[PDB]
Amino acid sequence: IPGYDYGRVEKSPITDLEFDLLKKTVMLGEKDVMYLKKAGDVLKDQVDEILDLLVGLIYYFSNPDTGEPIKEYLERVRARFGAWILDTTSRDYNREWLDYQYEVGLRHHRSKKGVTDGVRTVPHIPLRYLIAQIYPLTATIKPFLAKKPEDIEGMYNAWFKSVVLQVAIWSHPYTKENDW
Amino acid sequence: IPGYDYGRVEKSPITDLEFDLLKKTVMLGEKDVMYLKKAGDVLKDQVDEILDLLVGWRASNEHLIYYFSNPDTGEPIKEYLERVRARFGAWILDTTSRDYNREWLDYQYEVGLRHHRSKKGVTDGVRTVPHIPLRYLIAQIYPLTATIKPFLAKKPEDIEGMYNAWFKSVVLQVAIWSHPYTKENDW
Amino acid sequence: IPGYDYGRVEKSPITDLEFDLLKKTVMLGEKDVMYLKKAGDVLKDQVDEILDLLVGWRASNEHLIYYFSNPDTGEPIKEYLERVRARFGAWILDTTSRDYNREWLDYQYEVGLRHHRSKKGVTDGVRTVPHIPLRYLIAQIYPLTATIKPFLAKKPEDIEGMYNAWFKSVVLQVAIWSHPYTKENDW
Amino acid sequence: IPGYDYGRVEKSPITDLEFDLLKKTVMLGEKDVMYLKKAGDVLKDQVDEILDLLVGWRASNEHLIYYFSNPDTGEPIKEYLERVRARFGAWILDTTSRDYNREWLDYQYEVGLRHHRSKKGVTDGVRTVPHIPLRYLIAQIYPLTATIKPFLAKKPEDIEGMYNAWFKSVVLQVAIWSHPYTKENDW
Ligand code: HEM
Ligand code: HEM
Ligand code: HEM
Ligand code: HEM
Ligand SMILES: [Fe+3]
Ligand SMILES: [Fe+3]
Numbered sequence: 001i002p003g004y005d006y007g008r009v010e011k012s013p014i015t016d017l018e019f020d021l022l023k024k025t026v027m028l029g030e031k032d033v034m035y036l037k038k039a040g041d042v043l044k045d046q047v048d049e050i051l052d053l054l055v056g057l058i059y060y061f062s063n064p065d066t067g068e069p070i071k072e073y074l075e076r077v078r079a080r081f082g083a084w085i086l087d088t089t090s091r092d093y094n095r096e097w098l099d100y101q102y103e104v105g106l107r108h109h110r111s112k113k114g115v116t117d118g119v120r121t122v123p124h125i126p127l128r129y130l131i132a133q134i135y136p137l138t139a140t141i142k143p144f145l146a147k148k149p150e151d152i153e154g155m156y157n158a159w160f161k162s163v164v165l166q167v168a169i170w171s172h173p174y175t176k177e178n179d180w
Numbered sequence: 181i182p183g184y185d186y187g188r189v190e191k192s193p194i195t196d197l198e199f200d201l202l203k204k205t206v207m208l209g210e211k212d213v214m215y216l217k218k219a220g221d222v223l224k225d226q227v228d229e230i231l232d233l234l235v236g237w238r239a240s241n242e243h244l245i246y247y248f249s250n251p252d253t254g255e256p257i258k259e260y261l262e263r264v265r266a267r268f269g270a271w272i273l274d275t276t277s278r279d280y281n282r283e284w285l286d287y288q289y290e291v292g293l294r295h296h297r298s299k300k301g302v303t304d305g306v307r308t309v310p311h312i313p314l315r316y317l318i319a320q321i322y323p324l325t326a327t328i329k330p331f332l333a334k335k336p337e338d339i340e341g342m343y344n345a346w347f348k349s350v351v352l353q354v355a356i357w358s359h360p361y362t363k364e365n366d367w
Numbered sequence: 368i369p370g371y372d373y374g375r376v377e378k379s380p381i382t383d384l385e386f387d388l389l390k391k392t393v394m395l396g397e398k399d400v401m402y403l404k405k406a407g408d409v410l411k412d413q414v415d416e417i418l419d420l421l422v423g424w425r426a427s428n429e430h431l432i433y434y435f436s437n438p439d440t441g442e443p444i445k446e447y448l449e450r451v452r453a454r455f456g457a458w459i460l461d462t463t464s465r466d467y468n469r470e471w472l473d474y475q476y477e478v479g480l481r482h483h484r485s486k487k488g489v490t491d492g493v494r495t496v497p498h499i500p501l502r503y504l505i506a507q508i509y510p511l512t513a514t515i516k517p518f519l520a521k522k523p524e525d526i527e528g529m530y531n532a533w534f535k536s537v538v539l540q541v542a543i544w545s546h547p548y549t550k551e552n553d554w
Numbered sequence: 555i556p557g558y559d560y561g562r563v564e565k566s567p568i569t570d571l572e573f574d575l576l577k578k579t580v581m582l583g584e585k586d587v588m589y590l591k592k593a594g595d596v597l598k599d600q601v602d603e604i605l606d607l608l609v610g611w612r613a614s615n616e617h618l619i620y621y622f623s624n625p626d627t628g629e630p631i632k633e634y635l636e637r638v639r640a641r642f643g644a645w646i647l648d649t650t651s652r653d654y655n656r657e658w659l660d661y662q663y664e665v666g667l668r669h670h671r672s673k674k675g676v677t678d679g680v681r682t683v684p685h686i687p688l689r690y691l692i693a694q695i696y697p698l699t700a701t702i703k704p705f706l707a708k709k710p711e712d713i714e715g716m717y718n719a720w721f722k723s724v725v726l727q728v729a730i731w732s733h734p735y736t737k738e739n740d741w
């Protein structure tokens with residue numbers, strides 16, 4: 001998967017304790033981790049159905065000067081998104097994970113958006129939209145989790161925690177130097 | 181100066197007596213303190229010349245530009261070099277002009293952490309080489325001591341007193357820095 | 368000289384390139400090597416005077432006599448001081464006259480181990496303070512560099528070249544020594 | 555596992571086609587790959603039993619304890635044996651379960667370097683026999699292939715397929731390892 005760089009990115013400038021504390025704040029414990037892995041079992045063969053709901057805000061996949069969406073941008077991102085679905089549910093949330101989530105935040109940010117796919121695109125995804133997205137990208141997943149309640153709630157709250165945690169990480173390049 | 185946190189950092193886990201003893205081991209007495217202050221007078225307007233020798237985007241960075249680089253591409257990070265250089269310029273005057281008290285100790289410890297995987301890159305939010313090996317921190321004692329001497333002389337006992345004081349300080353600092361690098365009980 | 372094992376020790380777990388790079392970092396070039404050899408000429412007959420300043424049961428030892436002492440009584444161990452002093456006298460000339468090759472590196476590593484809890488006291492079969500904290504090894508860089516300079520001058524560019532070479536060597540050595548003191552991946 | 559660096563080592567200077575051709579020569583095809591994975595299932599919970607046959611402070615020893623020893627005293631280094639044994643336990647499962655891709659190749663090369671004077675002893679910071687002669691690396695192919703077979707059988711075509719796959723892998727690995735041992739153009 002072109003651009004998919006999980007495990008092959010630089011060290012994010014977020015300490016391991018800050019990360020620990022962030023997971024503590026979203027309440028992502030050992031129960032979540034197992035809920036996440038279970039969800040990975042459940043989402044597993046539903047990824048293309050999930051993708052068809054989400055990717056493949058079209059504006060942010062577009063050329064800004066013409067407003068035309070960039071097929072290959074949509075294509076390549078969708079594949080990395082499909083993998084992120086399973087990275088979210090199945091990776092251990094360790095430094096390697098943290099470092100990729102940071103990368104992914106940079107790729108929404110003017111710092112690296114468009115660079116991974118060599119496209120000429122909308123340079124930057126405003127933070128306000130990254131945070132708003134927390135809701136649709138959390139709630140979209142739940143029917144998927146249920147297609148195969150406590151179970152479903154545990155998986156679904158774990159997904160929720162992860163999406164929040166990720167966006168919390170992503171905010172760091174968007175935030176004023178000392179405000180994150 | 182972004183990141184420059186002198187006087188605003190947590191307490192280093194080195195006691196005041198350990199610090200006292202460290203200063204006695206490098207032989208940093210009242211004479212040094214005054215030599216240091218005089219050096220502060222002398223270095224004062226030479227800081228950019230000093231910086232151009234040591235750090236910055238367009239400065240001689242021999243073999244250790246890598247540690248200002250992105251590790252995966254090896255490309256130096258301009259702003260990292262920029263922001264560090266400014267804090268380094270201030271450190272030149274912190275070294276010569278601060279009283280070497282708990283506040284100083286606490287900053288030197290911070291500075292050691294910022295070379296260490298504990299906090300390197302965090303202050304400037306950069307994605308960089310995570311860690312500066314201790315071996316290089318100690319080796320650096322020589323170039324960062326000897327580089328300063330022509331500066332001290334540009335405007336002998338005097339110069340030697342200033343220069344030995346600088347030497348003691350650089351050593352003392354690196355001695356402090358080693359603490360996060362050392363095995364739990366070996367420091 | 369009992370315990371003096373130059374050229375007779377195991378291979379240090381530091382690569383030849385790491386060593387090369389370390390010498391590059393302290394800036395120890397061909398000029399230094401010759402400065403060192405000249406210093407060997409100059410220090411040559413001053414070794415006992417040097418020793419009386421630094422080590423020996425009847426020396427001007429500082430509070431670091433403790434590290435030559437029995438820890439439970441605090442009594443200095445004459446023979447420990449005696450035997451170490453002799454090896455130190457030889458180290459003075461090893462520093463100035465040996466080629467800084469793998470054989471040298473391997474001895475400097477040994478010497479660092481002998482300050483470390485790994486082998487301190489073993490060479491002289493003494494029951495002594497088990498370990499010399501790294502902080503003190505690094506602080507020592509200053510007194511063991513600066514002590515030598517009057518010696519170099521007793522017989523300026525010359526003296527500075529010899530003296531900076533000695534400085535580089537002391538730093539380089541302590542940089543090597545730090546390896547057994549450092550956390551597995553921090554050196 | 556300290557030192558265990560699978561997936562974290564530099565690029566081996568062996569091309570992807572040379573590697574492809576090497577796998578072709580040992581006849582390691584898709585059948586082997588699956589045999590290997592099946593062996594991973596089977597060896598799985600037998601690793602400590604395998605280890606006790608091959609490596610460790612108190613493992614049935616050949617006359618190659620020497621290579622885990624201090625060369626000057628001939629004393630085996632417990633922690634060296636300990637740390638290597640753990641990485642060996644992982645190698646058992648790396649051999650059976652990793653895809654034999656560039657990442658794998660790069661680790662096998664690393665592992666060959668760690669037998670070679672290039673890096674032996676460096677990973678565990680030990681002072682040890684500097685180098686494992688190539689002749690012994692190749693001879694080892696037999697015991698490290700044949701030792702595994704009872705393990706594979708404890709749970710024939712199956713067993714032969716797993717066992718020949720293991721054989722191919724051990725050979726392939728040693729073939730890779732030979733590169734740092736070989737004269738510049740002879741590999
Ligand atoms: C309005 C909000 C969002 C917009 C407009 C948006 C748009 C985009 C765009 C344009 C890319 C490709 C960026 C590039 O690499 O150049 C991307 C990548 C990606 N986005 Fe979003 N995104 C939003 C929110 C989110 C959220 C909340 C998540 C998940 C927590 C997310 C997950 C991903 C993933 C997983 C990738 C691919 C990451 C990779 O490169 O592996 N996005 N998104
Ligand atoms: C005697 C040895 C050294 C001295 C006195 C020294 C001095 C300094 C100072 C004063 C700073 C900024 C402190 C602050 O942020 O408040 C700094 C940061 C830094 N120096 Fe050094 N330095 C030494 C060794 C080294 C070495 C060996 C390297 C290798 C490249 C290095 C590279 C860096 C880097 C990358 C930073 C930024 C660290 C960070 O991410 O915060 N320095 N140094
Ligand atoms: C506070 C720091 C130090 C103290 C307290 C100290 C004390 C000692 C002691 C007790 C020994 C013998 C240890 C043993 O083998 O059991 C020793 C050995 C020695 N030390 Fe130090 N030392 C210090 C730092 C240094 C430094 C910085 C140098 C030179 C760079 C140095 C040079 C030597 C030499 C040459 C020997 C004998 C090495 C040999 O056995 O051949 N020491 N020192
Ligand atoms: C006479 C031949 C051999 C001897 C004496 C020997 C001994 C050793 C020694 C001393 C080490 C640690 C080296 C270091 O310092 O890094 C080691 C590591 C290792 N050996 Fe061997 N070895 C031999 C051949 C082989 C063979 C044929 C294999 C299997 C293909 C093998 C598998 C391993 C593994 C997997 C490790 C650890 C790799 C790692 O660090 O991840 N060795 N062996
Ligand atoms: Fe930050
Ligand atoms: Fe401590």
Ligand SMILES: [Fe+3]
Nearest residue numbers: 380551676679
């Ligand atoms: Fe090491």
Ligand SMILES: [Fe+3]
Nearest residue numbers: 567733738741
């Ligand atoms: Fe070759």
